[PDB]
Design a protein around this ligand. Structure first.
Ligand SMILES: Cc1ncsc1CCO
Ligand SMILES: Cc1ncsc1CCO
Ligand SMILES: Cc1ncsc1CCO
Ligand SMILES: [Cl-]
Lengths: 284, 284, 284
């Protein structure tokens, strides 16, 4: 089911190709194996079901190798990590690597404690990753940006710094780096894009980001290029979120959470084509 | 308190009696002890509360025997099992057995990985179960395929193939077998029934089956005969699910999940007596 | 971010001051580190985000000390405790004590099993707590090392005994004791208050109490006096609950839960000032 829905020889990844990827997810219902934190398990599963994917949660070292080998994508999330779960994530990741199943990492809280930072690097060192999704601070700490410079990530300013961070981190780790924030930045070793969809309400629902990383996995299961896969995932999620906010912005984060689940199931190819905002960044 | 709300010497289980058990659950608010997966814990607890029962979750080997013996029912779910949690489930089940507390099992994933099939089997070997609730494949692979026939060529589900599986499994494991899905069959050693109350939207809510097994536990806490208890539980859940679906319409799986919790609370004894569809199967 | 929003010199704690603390919580978005049960993690995080706080969940002994020292408050909840989690809770509490981070305890199920009663007591013995939040029975079983320690009249149920229970527990443990029920009673070593806000629908939402404890934590992060912080937290929460009920009372527990999250976000200073019912108990 891992097809090719876009190629740079035809131009920059765009809304139409993103919309195609979404339909492929609905069509193939990829099995997405998540080894995530216990604050977002139920939400992640429900979000994936709403979207049209097949979620599976298995954490036991006695069975993670077997589950990951048959999955369409593997997503590792250290939100509530333990030494045991980190072990399982690497066992699952190696099985995934051996079988060609793309692996996505969400380094939740990397930088907050040495344990999270090191566990994130342990995974990167022991597992080949198709992509890493996180906020600017988490990415900077994970890749090793020098202490004193990290501050350069604070506040909310853009136009190059965050864009360069993404490309430099991608070049260093040889993977796709997706930094979400006021403006989202996605890059691989030689290409960079900025995405402009979503709604601030997402910052008021726990797991909004964790679920997003799982959605990136679902798209990575049907699109061979993780960059394009991630761009389509984030754009689709963002449109779904904007549509959800229109119906609940005035009600509150509770109604919005529920409506996001509804929209992930009702958002159409037409919606993405019409509202997705994807911009290629001139790199040179 | 567990009593008898129906006897075979009073006819075959019917909606009338099912509604009576629902009222009994709400009147006694039985304590239902769950040792389940972290993907459905919150949803399971909220569903039981809405229904009218009192949920409690306890997993540590240092207390499961103590919590189980004071419960009205113990429910074991292997959704996100670990070697340690299964050992805890058995310790809990044995305490329940020694104190006369009904034990219900949900063999989630049995047949998907060897670890899961064997874990389900270990529990069955060490714990006397009042009932087992799961899908056809999970029941078949846990008991082991003996009878293969059902129907040739993809045409119809038949129904007799599942009825056969249910009763055979009930006889082999000497327990109540509740198989749910498109079919829906419940049976014990000498009796078999078919229920017809559900909705496809349940396939869009994670833990929809896990919560259903917990509800079966709530009913077994007040109805002495597990066959009657399971039938009442599933019928009531099914009616609630139908009402939730009506109210939901085309809103989405998020709205439906919320409405299911609402209806488990507002569904009435009269609603059950009216929509519960219970068919006793005449096999010979 | 921990300032003082009231002083007994200006009289007793009142709605006006409660309102100010709420605003303080939203201004600082205090980081609330919770080591809680797996049935309420998502609800707890979502509730804190809606309120305006910043939740973080960390449980591994490899990081709980590092996470606690940078938090605004530490919340310990034994709902689904394990030998490992209790150990981690104490490690986190000691670290928090070393840095002046307020620690709140929710002795869930204390008295139901010896392991929980013992565990609750081990934490109290090893960690200086700012406050303990639970129901009458849990507080009674926790402090009642002997059946005579807490002096009072033994009879059916309890009420006026609650105020006396609170006073004695607060004096014996040297901390703030918040007992919630149809009527809430909060006390420290020298003052006693009863609160009268909220709605019975809260008994139908799992984690309603666990979240409240976390909210007490968020307020303690911005108000140096734990008694005052606890009153403001419980009053604000109750008001949000009444407002949510008014719009959900006849829909069901599912709708209510969602509306509670909405209201924790939309409830204003004015709402608290007008609805919060705080009464100082003339004791002497
Ligand atoms: C806030 C939080 N803390 C640990 S995991 C988590 C969920 C990410 O949204
Ligand atoms: C998605 C999931 N993972 C383990 S159990 C479960 C719920 C089945 O609906
Ligand atoms: C009911 C329950 N059982 C274990 S923790 C818990 C959450 C408190 O509401
Ligand atoms: Cl967990």
């Amino acid at each position: 089911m891992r097809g090719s829905h876009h190629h740079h020889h035809h131009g920059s990844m765009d809304a139409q190709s993103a919309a195609k990827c979404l339909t492929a997810v609905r069509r193939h219902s990829p099995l997405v194996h998540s080894i995530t934190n216990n604050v977002v398990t139920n939400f992640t599963a429900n979000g994936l079901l709403a979207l049209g994917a097949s979620p599976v949660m298995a954490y036991a070292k006695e069975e993670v190798a077997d589950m990951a080998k048959i999955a369409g994508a593997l997503v590792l999330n250290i939100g509530t990590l333990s030494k045991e779960s980190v072990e399982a994530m690497i066992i699952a990741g190696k099985s995934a690597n051996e079988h060609g199943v793309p692996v996505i990492l969400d380094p939740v809280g990397a930088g907050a404690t040495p344990f999270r930072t090191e566990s994130a690097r342990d995974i990167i060192r022991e597992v080949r990753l198709a992509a890493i999704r996180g906020n600017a601070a988490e990415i900077a700490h994970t890749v090793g940006v020098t202490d004193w410079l990290i501050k350069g990530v604070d506040a909310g300013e853009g136009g190059g710094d965050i864009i360069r961070l993404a490309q430099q981190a991608a070049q260093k780790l040889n993977t796709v780096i997706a930094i979400t924030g006021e403006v989202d930045v996605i890059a691989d070793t030689s290409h960079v894009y900025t995405l402009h969809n979503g709604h601030k309400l997402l910052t008021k629902v726990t797991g909004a980001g964790c679920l997003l990383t799982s959605v990136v996995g679902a798209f990575c299961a049907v699109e061979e290029n993780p960059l394009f896969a991630a761009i389509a995932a984030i754009s689709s999620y963002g449109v779904a979120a904007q549509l959800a906010a229109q119906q609940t912005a005035d009600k509150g984060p509770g109604s919005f959470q529920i409506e996001l689940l509804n929209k992930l199931s009702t958002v159409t190819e037409q919606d993405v084509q019409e509202w997705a905002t994807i911009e290629r960044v001139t790199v040179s």
